[PDB]
Amino acid sequence: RTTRDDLINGNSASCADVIFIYARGSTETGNLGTLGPSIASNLESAFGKDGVWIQGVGGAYRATLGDNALPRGTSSAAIREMLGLFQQANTKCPDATLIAGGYSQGAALAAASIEDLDSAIRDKIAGTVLFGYTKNLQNRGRIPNYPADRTKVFCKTGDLVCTGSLIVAAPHLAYGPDARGPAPEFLIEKVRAVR
Numbered sequence: 001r002t003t004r005d006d007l008i009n010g011n012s013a014s015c016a017d018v019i020f021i022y023a024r025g026s027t028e029t030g031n032l033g034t035l036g037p038s039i040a041s042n043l044e045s046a047f048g049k050d051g052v053w054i055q056g057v058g059g060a061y062r063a064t065l066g067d068n069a070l071p072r073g074t075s076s077a078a079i080r081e082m083l084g085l086f087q088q089a090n091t092k093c094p095d096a097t098l099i100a101g102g103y104s105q106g107a108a109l110a111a112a113s114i115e116d117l118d119s120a121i122r123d124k125i126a127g128t129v130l131f132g133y134t135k136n137l138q139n140r141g142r143i144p145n146y147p148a149d150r151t152k153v154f155c156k157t158g159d160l161v162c163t164g165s166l167i168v169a170a171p172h173l174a175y176g177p178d179a180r181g182p183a184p185e186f187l188i189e190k191v192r193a194v195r
Contacts, residue, residue, distance in 0.1 A: 005056070007055040016052050019055065027065060035131055035179035040054040043188065046184070053093075057078070061075075073134050083113050101130070102130060107132060108134045126193075134166065136153060152186045154178045
């Protein structure tokens with residue numbers, strides 16, 4: 001399913017050990033889009049359904065095409081939506097590990113949100129996967145204020161967004177295998193190490 005609201009609809013008692021917050025690509029479906037579900041599926045298998053909450057970035061993040069041309073790669077309102085969710089994960093379930101992810105504009109949104117995040121909450125994000133990261137070049141394949149060794153960027157050769165463009169080419173559309181395999185397994189590695 002392309003819409004997951006496990007955290008906003010979640011009750012305390014049922015808090016998961018792991019909370020995954022994911023932002024989709026521009027003009028994608030639901031709040032998970034095309035890669036999000038594949039990544040959730042894999043995490044559910046690692047931790048069990050009761051062990052991980054899947055939470056896409058919806059709400060005010062409308063994932064419009066125009067918003068990629070704003071300064072940070074997405075709108076202010078979208079960043080404040082993802083900020084609030086990490087904020088709700090922090091508060092509703094204080095003892096869980098956060099993990100994060102995002103595709104194309106959603107990658108831009110993950111980056112900005114995490115750069116902005118209180119250090120304390122950010123400390124709790126074990127691993128972050130970016131696919132088709134639109135600020136890959138601008139930010140030197142980092143997320144500002146976040147350690148490289150918990151960041152894993154998937155930026156396929158010939159994906160032009162990875163090299164300062166916004167042209168969408170065939171490699172940009174080819175993160176499918178990555179989202180089923182290596183991207184969740186990195187997030188599973190990272191959680192398990194700290195937990």
